[PDB]
Structure formats: C-alpha cells, structure tokens
Design a protein around this motif. Structure first.
Motif, PDB file in Angstrom:
ATOM      1  N   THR A   1       0.933  -1.183   0.069  1.00 30.88           N
ATOM      2  CA  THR A   1      -0.025  -0.006   0.083  1.00 30.88           C
ATOM      3  C   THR A   1       0.898   1.281   0.217  1.00 30.88           C
ATOM      4  OG1 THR A   1      -1.725  -1.227   1.192  1.00 30.88           O
ATOM      5  CG2 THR A   1      -1.743   1.183   1.368  1.00 30.88           C
ATOM      6  N   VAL A   2       1.811   1.224   0.845  1.00 29.88           N
ATOM      7  CA  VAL A   2       2.823   2.292   1.022  1.00 29.88           C
ATOM      8  C   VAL A   2       4.426   2.145   0.783  1.00 29.88           C
ATOM      9  CG1 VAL A   2       3.591   4.025   2.296  1.00 29.88           C
ATOM     10  CG2 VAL A   2       1.379   3.467   2.581  1.00 29.88           C
TER      11      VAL A   2
ATOM     12  N   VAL B   1       2.326  12.512   0.645  1.00 28.38           N
ATOM     13  CA  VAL B   1       1.947  11.203   0.113  1.00 28.38           C
ATOM     14  C   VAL B   1       1.661  11.462  -1.309  1.00 28.38           C
ATOM     15  CG1 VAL B   1       0.159   9.326  -0.114  1.00 28.38           C
ATOM     16  CG2 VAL B   1       0.810  10.475   2.108  1.00 28.38           C
TER      17      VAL B   1
ATOM     18  N   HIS C   1       0.767   3.898  -2.804  1.00 36.20           N
ATOM     19  CA  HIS C   1       1.255   5.150  -2.758  1.00 36.20           C
ATOM     20  C   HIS C   1       2.702   5.167  -2.233  1.00 36.20           C
ATOM     21  CE1 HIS C   1      -2.813   6.826  -1.891  1.00 36.20           C
ATOM     22  NE2 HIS C   1      -3.009   5.853  -0.835  1.00 36.20           N
TER      23      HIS C   1
ATOM     24  N   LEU D   1       5.109   7.369   0.168  1.00 37.88           N
ATOM     25  CA  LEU D   1       5.129   8.351   1.105  1.00 37.88           C
ATOM     26  C   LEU D   1       6.711   8.997   1.100  1.00 37.88           C
ATOM     27  CD1 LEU D   1       4.205   9.763   3.828  1.00 37.88           C
ATOM     28  CD2 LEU D   1       5.258   7.929   5.076  1.00 37.88           C
TER      29      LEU D   1
ATOM     30  N   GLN E   1       1.381   7.521  10.456  1.00 37.01           N
ATOM     31  CA  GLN E   1       0.240   7.753   9.769  1.00 37.01           C
ATOM     32  C   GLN E   1      -0.240   6.622   8.685  1.00 37.01           C
ATOM     33  OE1 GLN E   1      -1.632  10.530  10.459  1.00 37.01           O
ATOM     34  NE2 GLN E   1      -0.192  10.678  12.253  1.00 37.01           N
ATOM     35  N   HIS E   2       0.589   5.594   8.819  1.00 39.36           N
ATOM     36  CA  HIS E   2       0.135   4.402   7.663  1.00 39.36           C
ATOM     37  C   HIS E   2       0.222   3.155   8.404  1.00 39.36           C
ATOM     38  CE1 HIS E   2       0.178   7.438   4.562  1.00 39.36           C
ATOM     39  NE2 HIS E   2       1.410   7.964   5.037  1.00 39.36           N
TER      40      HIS E   2
ATOM     41  N   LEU F   1       3.963  -0.216   6.170  1.00 44.35           N
ATOM     42  CA  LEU F   1       4.900   0.282   5.032  1.00 44.35           C
ATOM     43  C   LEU F   1       6.014  -0.568   4.774  1.00 44.35           C
ATOM     44  CD1 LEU F   1       4.828   2.257   8.042  1.00 44.35           C
ATOM     45  CD2 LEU F   1       5.060   4.075   6.099  1.00 44.35           C
TER      46      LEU F   1
END
Length: 165
Positions: free
Chosen positions: A29-30, A78, A87, A89, A114-115, A118
């Motif tokens: 996702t990140v 982001v 995404h 970061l 905030q995630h 990662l």
C-alpha cells in the motif's frame, strides 16, 4: 504479503533486499522514499525508485513542488506509488552531509505512524550520511505501525541484525 523478513520487535521487520525489487514483488500500500525537500530523486533510494517508475515519480514530484513548495526536513508528502506501490510516502530525513540536525530523524520517522503498514528504507542512511545503526534504533523507538525495512547492503544488514539490542 511480505516474505523472508526477520522480526526485530512487535512491529519492526527487516530484510536484506533491494527496495525497488521488493516494491515490484509485494506492490505494498505504501513504499517510503528517502526524499530530499525538493523531491529531486537523483541518487540513492530516491534515484532507484524514480528510475523504476520510468521518471513518472519525478514528473509528478516537480508538479507537486510547483504547487506546494519544498517539504520541511523531517516532513513528508503522500504521492502516487506508480508501478511500485499504491502510494509513495516521500519522507525527508536529515542529510548529515549538509549539516542537517540529526535530532530531526525522529520527526522524520513519526511520518510512518500515519500509515498502518509500510515498505521502507532506513531514513538518513546511505548517501544521507547518518549511522544506519542509529537510524534503526530511532525507527524501532519511534514507529508504532508495521514497518518492513529493506536494507540493500548485505554486510550492513548483518551488522544491523547482529548488533540489534
């Protein structure tokens, strides 16, 4: 999901891997980029991630800077993960090879909170000049979310694991 990682703590994991190859495999996702305030992805992790996106990351980044101005050291933004992740970061750790305050490394890692999960490099390590052992310690003492650290250099990876307290 993430495979072949060594568990360091409840939420921090580490692997000897090329973060670009790791990102293409997992498509997390990140993915975290070791960015500078200008989002000029010239070398290190930033240059490698940008080259993997066929420069689409740099094109998107220049539009972001034109609109918003530079990031702060310790800050983040982001943007799209392109072909690497949902995404990216972009996190700015202090570059000690530019006299930037190493105390900003904790602020830089706070962006990871905030995630939920990662894929990341060690902030301020490599061409940013900081001690990677110090970066890993700041990471485990700051990040509370699930972070999968990719360490490119095998010899550094072994030194990081063998010396982890």
């Amino acid at each position: 999901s993430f495979s072949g990682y060594l568990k360091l703590t409840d939420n921090v994991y580490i692997k000897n891997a090329d973060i670009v190859e790791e990102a293409k495999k997992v498509k997390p996702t990140v993915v975290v980029n070791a960015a500078n305030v200008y989002l000029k992805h010239g070398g290190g992790v930033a240059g490698a991630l940008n080259k993997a996106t066929n420069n689409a990351m740099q094109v998107e980044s220049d539009d972001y800077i034109a609109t918003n101005g530079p990031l702060k050291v310790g800050g983040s933004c982001v943007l799209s993960g392109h072909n690497l992740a949902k995404h990216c970061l972009h996190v700015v750790g202090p570059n000690v090879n530019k006299g930037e305050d190493i105390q900003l490394l904790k602020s830089a890692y706070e962006n990871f909170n905030q995630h939920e999960v990662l894929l990341a490099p060690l902030l301020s390590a490599g061409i940013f000049g900081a001690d990677p052992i110090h970066s890993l310690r700041v990471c485990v003492d700051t990040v509370r979310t699930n972070v999968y650290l990719a360490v490119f250099d095998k010899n550094l990876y072994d030194k990081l694991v063998s010396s982890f307290l």
